[PDB]
């Protein structure tokens, strides 16, 4: 309780979404520097999403980790929402990623146990967020990860998966085939974002949603040359094709090579 748009002052485009832009802005009262998500009524409603929103603020309002950005509330007027979050001031590690190419063993390591804890305290509530892709997850000011955007959690198990569009990706076989699913699919995003880290591309990438589906379904990944063992055991592990074969985020914090490079 209880903000409206006129208490902020809005700075620079931040990024935009499918739905979402994001701006800089500060609080007039306070001057506290945060992050406004702007969405489009008109968008959201026609069609498809207006519930995921709902999901997303209700979801991340409640959620509270040095690990995942936080929702400090919201408003709206009518002809927008804005959700409040807090300001990530590194950027994605989409933009790193697009920046450096590839990430060294040790940076890679790190990122995955920041997702490995946030993912694990998500778990702790039956909450998975099923969307863990680089353009959503976020770097604080000490370069820590945070995991952000909350349109697509949901309460496990859940089915449907609704219907999603754009990549395929980051999804494991039993979302792209429609059926019910774990907090497994967020193990199997850990697996696609680590090997994405090390070779600088997801493991399943195709120039068709087709042949991506294809891979994916059929789980056809394979190794450069310069991926180190311990780390293309840890990506076979996480990347199996039935749910309860992947591993516990314990048995992925205490890999010996996440142990061995992580700092
Ligand atoms: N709190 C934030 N701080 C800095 N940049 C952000 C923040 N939230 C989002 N962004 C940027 O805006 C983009 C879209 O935000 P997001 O909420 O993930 O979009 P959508 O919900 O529309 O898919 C992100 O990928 C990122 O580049
Ligand atoms: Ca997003
Ligand atoms: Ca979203």
Redesign the pocket.
């Known amino acids: 309780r209880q903000w409206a748009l006129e208490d902020f002052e809005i700075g620079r485009p931040?990024?935009?979404?499918?739905?979402?832009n994001?701006y800089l802005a500060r609080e007039k009262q306070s001057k506290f520097i945060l992050?406004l998500?702007v969405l489009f009524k008109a968008q959201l409603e026609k069609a498809g999403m207006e519930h995921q929103l709902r999901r997303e603020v209700e979801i991340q309002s409640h959620l509270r980790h040095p690990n995942i950005?936080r929702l400090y509330g919201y408003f709206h007027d009518a002809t927008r929402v804005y959700l409040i979050?807090?300001?990530?001031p590194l950027?994605?590690v989409?933009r790193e990623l697009q920046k450096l190419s590839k990430f060294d063993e040790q940076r890679t390591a790190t990122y995955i146990t920041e997702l490995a804890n946030a993912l694990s305290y998500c778990h702790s509530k039956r909450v998975i967020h099923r969307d863990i892709k680089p353009?959503?997850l976020?770097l604080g000011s000490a370069g820590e990860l945070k995991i952000?955007?909350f349109?697509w959690s949901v309460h496990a198990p859940s089915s449907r998966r609704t219907t999603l569009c754009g990549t395929l990706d980051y999804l494991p076989p039993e979302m792209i085939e429609g059926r019910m699913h774990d907090e497994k699919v967020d193990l199997w995003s850990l697996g696609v974002l680590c090997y994405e880290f090390l070779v600088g591309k997801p493991p399943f990438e195709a120039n068709t949603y087709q042949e991506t589906y294809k891979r994916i379904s059929r789980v056809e990944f394979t190794f450069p040359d310069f991926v180190t063992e311990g780390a293309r055991d840890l990506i076979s592990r996480l990347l199996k094709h039935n749910p309860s074969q992947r591993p516990m985020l314990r048995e992925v914090l205490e890999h010996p090579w996440i142990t061995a490079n992580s700092s």
């Open positions: 931040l990024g935009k979404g499918k739905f979402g994001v992050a998500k950005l979050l807090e300001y990530a950027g994605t989409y353009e959503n976020l952000a955007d349109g």
